[PDB]
Amino acid sequence: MWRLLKLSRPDLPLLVAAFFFLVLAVLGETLIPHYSGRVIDILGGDFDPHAFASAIFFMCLFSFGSSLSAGCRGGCFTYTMSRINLRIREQLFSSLLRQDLGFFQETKTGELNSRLSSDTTLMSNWLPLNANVLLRSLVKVVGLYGFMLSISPRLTLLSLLHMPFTIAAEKVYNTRHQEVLREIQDAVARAGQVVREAVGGLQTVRSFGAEEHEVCRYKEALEQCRQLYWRRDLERALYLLVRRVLHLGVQMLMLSCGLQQMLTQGSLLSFMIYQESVGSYVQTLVYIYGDMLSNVGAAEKVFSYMDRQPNLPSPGTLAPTTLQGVVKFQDVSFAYPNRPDRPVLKGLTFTLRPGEVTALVGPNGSGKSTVAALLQNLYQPTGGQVLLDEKPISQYEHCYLHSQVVSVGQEPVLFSGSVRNNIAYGLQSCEDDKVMAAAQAAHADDFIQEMEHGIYTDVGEKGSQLAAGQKQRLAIARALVRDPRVLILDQATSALDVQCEQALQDWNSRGDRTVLVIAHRLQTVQRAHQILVLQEGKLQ
Amino acid sequence: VRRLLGCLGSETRRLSLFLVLVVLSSLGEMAIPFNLTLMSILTIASAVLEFVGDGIYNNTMGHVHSHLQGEVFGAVLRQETEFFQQNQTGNIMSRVTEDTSTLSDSLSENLSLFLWYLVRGLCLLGIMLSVSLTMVTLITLPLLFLLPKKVGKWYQLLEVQVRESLAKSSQVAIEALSAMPTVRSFANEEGEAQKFREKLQEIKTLNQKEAVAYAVNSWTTSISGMLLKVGILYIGGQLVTSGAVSSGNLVTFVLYQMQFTQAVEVLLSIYPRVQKAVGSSEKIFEYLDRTPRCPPSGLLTPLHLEGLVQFQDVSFAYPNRPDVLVLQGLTFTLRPGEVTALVGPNGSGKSTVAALLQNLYQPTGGQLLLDGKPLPQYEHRYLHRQVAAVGQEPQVFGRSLQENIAYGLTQKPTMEEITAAAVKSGAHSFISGLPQGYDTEVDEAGSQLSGGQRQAVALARALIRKPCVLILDDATSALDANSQLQVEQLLYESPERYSRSVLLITQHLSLVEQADHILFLEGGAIREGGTHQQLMEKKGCYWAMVQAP
Ligand SMILES: Nc1ncnc2c1ncn2[C@@H]1O[C@H](COP(=O)(O)OP(=O)(O)OP(=O)(O)O)[C@@H](O)[C@H]1O
Ligand SMILES: Nc1ncnc2c1ncn2[C@@H]1O[C@H](COP(=O)(O)OP(=O)(O)OP(=O)(O)O)[C@@H](O)[C@H]1O
Ligand SMILES: [Mg+2]
Ligand SMILES: [Mg+2]
Q1: Structural domains in chain B, sorted by start
Q2: Sheet of strand B469-473: strand arrangement
Q3: I need a labelling partner for B378 at 20 to 30 A (CA). Which of B102, B236, B299, B417 fits?
Q4: What's the CATH number where A502 sits?
Q5: Helix, coil or strand: residue A255
Q6: How many domains are contained in chain A?
Q7: In chain B, which residue's Cα lies nearest the Cα of A472?
Q8: B534-544 burial, b if ≥16 CB within 10 A, otherwise e?
Q9: Are A384 and A270 within one domain?
């Protein structure tokens, strides 16, 4: 409820400046209805050459100044209420990119995209939606207040009595509104998940003919949002009706307090309609205050995502020039944070030498890919230690560690850039000779020349334009372009044919690189120096 | 501009029950003020009016909203497949959700404001009727329409790029979020943040012009209204000296005149908002009226079907790169009770043959026949029920396992065949290990399962339909040596083998020895075709592939 005002610091030289064009509005407007009367009373007092032209000139200058202030204020407000939204969006994305992996399995991608694309406008919607009528209204209210200051010594019982009627319901409503103002978001974002699960898997869905199923699910998700919107609008309208109905109590009380004296009928009957008016405007004030506070407070989830701290360990400062490459497991036992109390690894312990090939085999679900992902400091072992050289792996610098240790995963996921922007992913700057060398090293240059624009070919999402083998070759080239010290590859032979597999047999032909390979077909790993077999999460 | 009447008129009946009320409030304003509760009984009645109008109108507006978002998304799903890779996922998300939401809120505010001020302006015009000064005001009124006519096109052109850059930024965000382990394994979070800021720079650039345009519009509206007020009051004051009418006759005429100007400057202010909404409904209305280039659904649903598939001179070219031909001369036949194994090097186009068989695309210069009839003739649901496939990369959605296995079936099979298909594919051997059984939840893209488990789940999904044509495409890539024999049984030992036509696309040479037919596909052309022994006796490319180690 306060942090967003800390986000309004760089908008400091606009907002108060906008308030300047606020006051230069009313400083004109408070001189508008008087001299305009000087234009109309001269209808009964006709003096054409001198007074009429002077009154017209003064009215024209006053209205010109008022409009010149109002337009500049509107421009400044419309700029600020988009700059705030842009800063909130950028900071939310930078906070979301920092959290741990286990946060991304509890939540869904559509939920986070809907928090990015719908809740930020709800943050930035706290500006007064209708303001021109409000500025005319405040000037009119000030003038009416100044006119009714002539009944001062009997108004001592009026200002105090205007406070406490129907205000005890207000603390109810700002509760019953606010929860609704949260729930619709939790009905919108979940609905925004549905349009994910079709579109991102469209080639799957058309493979089964389930378009009407997804459309039915989307309409079912939309019906709940419609019901929540109708409930919110009905509650607001009912509150407005009950406030306008119960507002007349002070009116009839002051009418009785006026008529008990029988000042005369010309001084009280022609007096009541102006406070009967401005009661509605002070109700408008308190209503816009409550709505603004509710709109600010309706994003506790976005503020929690802003302030959430990950469970990642303290980053390390270590980044030595040399690196031997000896890897050690010391009684490592790991359980996933999403599904605890079911261990996956049950006390693994081995050692990887700098200059020999270690192969790992095991059945489906045995946990080899868990070992590969744990070796890259993506997760944290509950017990035991993972040691690179003589130091723990969590004490290394992030970019240095992920530039020395690289992996080819079970399924490579590609991005929507060019081929050069995908081979050189994660590199700040690299020469074209390195990319060409990595392309020749993975036998990827035979199909680089085939596709149009050479190496600058656009590749769509997840490598849709390429085949599976070409995607595997690009992933291998991406891993090999860094010239690493520890290279973990699992199932790199998933889609490569026999010829490429035979032509890419020995990864350790260089003789100075630590290689870990994971494979299912045991004949492929007959050339490995060391063979490891694990069953149910325990090494045999 | 008036493109909305085709998508609002179905609600206008309810709007009629609003519109009458509108004048029921409007004559409340026009009526002159004509017993201690005399100021009460009217007043609360007015409050009751404030409950019946906006109580009904909002109840219609949601029906405009939730229906419209139910239509545009439908217009997404009727388009052809090659559209879905021309437009990114984030772009389709943005145009489906936020443009529709912005258009709905803009309509829901501006329609109410436009009605509630046009009726008041019409009543204010009516009540003041000297004829001559009213006619003078009505002839100087349409001069003010010249500048918003030249302002609206600029507003549309400015706002379209805002929507485009917002969609691109959302695409960057979702692409960064959906591949989180790959992002973190290379330590490239700062690159994604830089891409997001580079996307947001365009939004800031266009907003700094949006603010200036709004300020200039407000300036021109206030200046035009003020100057017209001074003009009419001046001509009235000049006509006073020639008699005209009395002081009391014009002392209310000028008041109704300034009230009419107040009524008309609001419409002048809401014209650019209408133009902005018209610009906002640009890309969405392209999706609704876009003619899908794919052939539509068929109507034949034969009760008896055999797995006879014929490829006659089939040639295909991808629409992204139509100058090349991926497939040249395919011509073969698949029979029930037989196994055909399609093998070849990488980049040959076997997945393209699988995509052509599933009616995802259309052949360019050939014929594809299922039981002597073309594929678009069959009904969509029946065709995709009678033809099942696995795909090179299986996908699993975020629901229960019993819903992932039985996905897409309107018949809703019960527990028994689900368990039987999980046992037959070998998936059940771990499915019973899960604590919640078949009711367990798996998140997006199957991040809770391994590769072999995901392939087994996909195979069990493809099995449960009992298809006549089955396409296995690298279904044994992630499976170990224990489960794969089940697939081998599924090819050669199951009693249902006589009821299916299997198209096998694998690089595992152990499973292709027992195939009835083996096809070698290179460069989009059939190089060799025959049995295993016929290919082994002659010298050919398949012999080289076998004898490579
Ligand atoms: N992110 C995750 N969250 C929860 N459980 C997971 C996750 N990843 C894997 N598991 C579970 O861990 C076990 C094995 O995981 P893993 O993917 O490492 O197996 P694997 O034996 O290497 O697989 P493969 O079948 O690909 O050879 C399975 O029970 C799987 O459900
Ligand atoms: N959506 C697409 N748009 C453009 N070209 C494509 C598309 N999909 C595939 N291609 C191209 O078609 C050719 C073969 O594609 P396909 O995926 O069918 O190969 P494949 O032989 O089945 O693959 P693999 O042996 O790796 O499994 C390649 O040149 C590839 O770039
Ligand atoms: Mg694995
Ligand atoms: Mg393929």
Answers
A1: 8-289 (1.20.1560.10), 309-546 (3.40.50.300)
A2: B387-389, B469-473, B501-505, B339-343, B517-522, B525-530
A3: B417
A4: 3.40.50.300
A5: helix
A6: 2
A7: B346
A8: ebbeeebebee
A9: no
